[PDB]
Design a protein around this ligand. Sequence first.
Ligand SMILES: O=C1CC[C@H](N2C(=O)c3ccccc3C2=O)C(=O)N1
Ligand SMILES: [Zn+2]
Length: 112
Amino acid sequence: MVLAPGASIFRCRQCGQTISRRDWLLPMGGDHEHVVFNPAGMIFRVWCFSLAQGLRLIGAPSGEFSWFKGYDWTIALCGQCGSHLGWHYEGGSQPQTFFGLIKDRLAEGPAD
Ligand SMILES: O=C1CC[C@H](N2C(=O)c3ccccc3C2=O)C(=O)N1
Ligand SMILES: [Zn+2]
């Protein structure tokens, strides 16, 4: 669609690991962005993606405190540097799985 796009790929902000792409943004409940808080009171602006790479999913899934009805989550770390980038969601419906990534922990930039 455009030549030399600068808003193509999302990398880990801390190390540059390739994580996702703007093309893979997923409008869960009508919006790719969901503003949420955890039990420790931390607020996250979470962007939902159909796909991601370069992460390491830690532990078994849990349904507790899930921000997305019908989904269980696993912590998603940057597979390169260990930065906590978000969560992988599974066990739900349409889609069965997706990633919720913390927007401000990613850097956006040109394709590879
Ligand atoms: O969908 C989710 C993902 C996990 C997230 N969450 C956290 O970020 C957290 C931090 C410490 C203890 C417990 C939790 C927890 O469930 C949360 O609250 N909802
Ligand atoms: Zn990283």
